[PDB]
From a paper:
BRCC36 is the catalytic subunit responsible for the majority of K63-Ub specific DUB activity in the cytoplasm and in the nucleus as part of two distinct macromolecular assemblies characterized by the presence of either of the MPN− pseudo DUB proteins KIAA0157 or Abraxas. The Abraxas complex (ARISC) functions in DNA repair and breast cancer suppression, while the BRCC36 isopeptidase complex (BRISC) promotes interferon dependent responses by deubiquitinating and stabilizing the type I interferon receptor, IFNAR1. BRCC36 consists of a functional metalloprotease JAMM/MPN+ domain followed by a predicted coiled coil region implicated in protein-protein interactions. KIAA0157 and Abraxas are required for the catalytic function of BRCC36 in both complexes, and enable association of two additional shared subunits (BRCC45 and MERIT40) to each holoenzyme.
Optimization of the CfKIAA0157 construct boundaries by deletion of poorly conserved C-terminal residues 290 to 471 (CfKIAA0157ΔC) yielded crystals in complex with full length CfBRCC36 (residues 1-253) that diffracted to 2.55 Å resolution. We solved the CfBRCC36–KIAA0157ΔC crystal structure using the seleno-methionine-SAD method (See Methods for seleno-methionine protein production and crystallographic details). Following manual rebuilding and refinement, two highly interdigitated CfBRCC36–KIAA0157ΔC heterodimers were apparent in the asymmetric unit, arranged in the suspected super dimer configuration. The final model displayed good crystallographic and geometric statistics (Rwork/Rfree = 0.189/0.240; see Table 1 for data collection and refinement statistics). The structure of each protomer of CfBRCC36 and CfKIAA0157 consisted of a canonical MPN domain (residues 1–165 in BRCC36 comprising an eight strand β-sheet flanked by three α-helices and residues 1–180 in KIAA0157 comprising a seven strand β-sheet flanked by three α-helices), followed by two non-canonical helices α4 and α5 within the predicted coiled coil regions. CfBRCC36 and CfKIAA0157ΔC protomers heterodimerized through a large buried surface area (SA) of 8112 Å2. The MPN domains of each associated in a pseudo two-fold manner centered on helices α1, resulting in a unified β-sheet and “fused” MPN+–MPN− superstructure (buried SA = 2902 Å2). Non-canonical helices α4 and α5 of CfBRCC36 interacted with helices α4 and α5 of CfKIAA0157 in the form of a coiled coil helical bundle (CCHB). Ab initio modeling and comparison of the calculated scattering curves for the heterodimer and the four possible super dimers with the experimental data using CRYSOL was most consistent with the two-fold symmetric super dimer configuration centered on CfBRCC36 helix α5 that buried 3093 Å2 of surface area. Contacts were predominantly hydrophobic in nature involving reciprocal patches composed by Leu198, Ile201, Ala205 and Ile212 side chains on opposing CfBRCC36 protomers.
Author numbering:
A (entry chain D): 5 to 42, 55 to 74, 77 to 163, 165 to 185, 188 to 196, 201 to 215, 218 to 271
B (entry chain B): 3 to 42, 53 to 74, 78 to 185, 188 to 197, 204 to 217, 221 to 272
C (entry chain C): 6 to 54, 65 to 147, 151 to 251
D (entry chain A): 4 to 250
Write the structure that this text describes.
Amino acid sequence: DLLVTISGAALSLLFFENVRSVGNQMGFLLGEALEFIVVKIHINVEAIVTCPLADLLHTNHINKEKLKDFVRDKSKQVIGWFCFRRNTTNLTLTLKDKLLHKQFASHFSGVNGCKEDFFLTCLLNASTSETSGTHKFRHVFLRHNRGMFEPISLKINNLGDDASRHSDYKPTPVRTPDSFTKLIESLNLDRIDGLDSAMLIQKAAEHHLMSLIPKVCESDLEVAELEKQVHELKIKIATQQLAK
Amino acid sequence: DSDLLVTISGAALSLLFFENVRSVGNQMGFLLGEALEFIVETVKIHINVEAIVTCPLADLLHNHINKEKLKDFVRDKSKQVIGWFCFRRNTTNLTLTLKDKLLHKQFASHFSGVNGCKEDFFLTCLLNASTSETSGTHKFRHVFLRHNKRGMFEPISLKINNLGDDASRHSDYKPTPVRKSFTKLIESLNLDVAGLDSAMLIQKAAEHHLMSLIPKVCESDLEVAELEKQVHELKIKIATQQLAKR
Amino acid sequence: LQKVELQTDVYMVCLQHALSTENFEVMGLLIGNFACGIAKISAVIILRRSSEQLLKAAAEAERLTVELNRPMRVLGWYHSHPHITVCPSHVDVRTQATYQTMDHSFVGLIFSVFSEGKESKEHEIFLNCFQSEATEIPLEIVHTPDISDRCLRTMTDLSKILVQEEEDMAEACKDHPDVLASIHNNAVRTRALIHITDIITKPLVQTFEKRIALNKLRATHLQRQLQELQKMC
Amino acid sequence: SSLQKVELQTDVYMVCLQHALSTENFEVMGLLIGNFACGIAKISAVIILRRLDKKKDRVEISSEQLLKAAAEAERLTVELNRPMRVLGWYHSHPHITVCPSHVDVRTQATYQTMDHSFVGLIFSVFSEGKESKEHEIFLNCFQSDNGEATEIPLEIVHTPDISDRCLRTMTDLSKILVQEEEDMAEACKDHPDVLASIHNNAVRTRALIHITDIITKPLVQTFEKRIALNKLRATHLQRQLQELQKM
Ligand SMILES: [Zn+2]
């Protein structure tokens, strides 16, 4: 069958972007799908990115031109989209949602991108009790099978259990090196030698992860500064245009 | 008096039972193995039974144990003796008899001072066999005990090491014990070092060695079997003579 | 204590910690400043699984007070409920209780995770803010423009802790005389390390790097808009 | 020609028991070979079988295994100058009673439509009182009547040794276990991910070492110590043999 997998890291970042969001939020899911014979398919979402829906419209019609301008080369990695709504504990697909999933699914589908049968819509909501002492976060992954959407299972890969266990052995998949694969090859490694390889990878990873913290901070400041400038400039000329 | 655990392999236990069910009557013998200490701050004791040997109790008596006769039989193997066993037929009762206790005390004392470790955990293994009315169902019971410092006989937990669970699973790491032949095989083949795939090479070497032992086991089994036969006949020949003179 | 203001970047750290394991409860301390009834939580400490733990958490708050030049102290605690409801167990209420005798206005946070429906296939994560029977305290997750330097480093510390937990165990059977045992322990240790790299460390590396990358995607997008808008002036 | 009694050789008894003791988590199974006398199945040979199912009550011997077992029997017939045939089967009950389950009775009954005197043996192992520390193992010899199991009288007959073939059967177990592991590891060979290949090697090395430690090593120790302790008794008996002749 089918299965959506994701790490605690990636999931935590998505939830982070949702909660810090001023209003409701939309964005795209990045990752890759693999097939495993036993045929089952794992769709792993590696990362997310937020984008203003009002920056992709002409009406309810999506502007496929402005969409390409935004995603910009990273369209290949796109495997779905997500929509975050507030307070509404409702977790059902609206009409506008299905229309957006169809539009998005067709645009990123094809030989170059992902499979249309495997394009995901991720719905997320955030409610709160009257006292606001308890916060409820609900989410679900969906796909368009017949002609009726069905919820697809989600496995959050963790130390206790992960999608790879279906035996203890990691089954090989059928059929663009990431940054971690790059770091591995960087060590030029070649069993008791399996241990030495493991320890070296651990140290390399630790050191590499620590040099990213300062880079991540500077990127967050750059993008957060530009956001503020654009938001105010819009308001500036909006108040001007409203005067003349 | 510090936590104690007895351990044994399926191989060793099956040999013990084999030897028991072979015997014509009740049977007695010694347990051979090694005691190990682990620190967990508390100390636990693992007493592993590696092998067993039978002996006619009459070859050691006078119902008092003849120490010279015992030394004569055990003979240099006494350092490996960690207990004794007693097998009883056609009974479900698994309680230590007064004669059993006297023998445990004697054996414990003997191997205690000599080499067989401390007197506190010299072992008595008690086994028995019984069958239902139709003899379609056979029951085998066994238990380990020792003589604690308070002059009491207390039963000891037994763990039969197997693929599903073993004593070394205190995490998955096997802890190093307090310091103090299969290994001889690995060393002779220089297999105790390795990107060779040592696990497979050791296993195969074990398999090959196992195969060369089979004829040796057979040869020794026949040898001791013929001697048992010859000795039993003379004993009967001598026994009947004393009857006639009485 | 009237209400709690928990920063989004701290919230993310706690959630990430909760999602690290499915078969155990995870735990950590909260750091911040307490003003007029409300507790502003802006820092977090990931704990092993104490007296020595409290010390390192107290030391952190001291170092933050100097670096940020604002009063930082351990304000509360959090721990996860995998396959459980957010409702604080009897032990949750008791632990929270002893903390209050040491500190009124001491807040407890419970993160329920890994709760999916049979055929629904919908997930639920609850965040419960409580004190001590368990009384609910009003909570508001407050926006941050970024992930703090300290919150980023806290995420990476879980990776270090897990590896140190594994090194300490492997050390306790370092020179095993039996070759089979030795080969076993090394195989065990090798699987454990690669298990930490695959589940925790690598995913964290990939998340950091792709956030940086995707930030630049959005960034260049924003400046395209900033030029198009600047024309109107 | 009705099954009146089973005579099970003690060395075949040792092989089965040893096999059952290999694991407390799963049931094991094998086939019994011997000759059927006047109402008596004399069992003097055993084949250890590979079980693929992890099903708790689903213990089935395949048709491919029966044929190979029959081939072996035919070889023993020639080798030992004596009529050998597949006479029955055995399996283990770890952590449960020795009493044949519904599936056990239904399976034995099938074997009896193939062979009216087919023997069924169940070895119960790994049961012990948490308080007494006492362990129990049962051995049940049964056939399937009108839907119910019924006891078949069992005698474990004395052997002066452990026969060559019984010794060889014991050595087959680790070989089988290793082969199972090999097959599983085979399905994931040549993994492109460095982290996964390192993982898989770690898993394979631990599983293999596991077999060597629990099974192969102990059997090596048991064989070698039998030889040594036989010689100890051997020399003992000889010294005693001189004294008795003097009498
Ligand atoms: Zn059964």
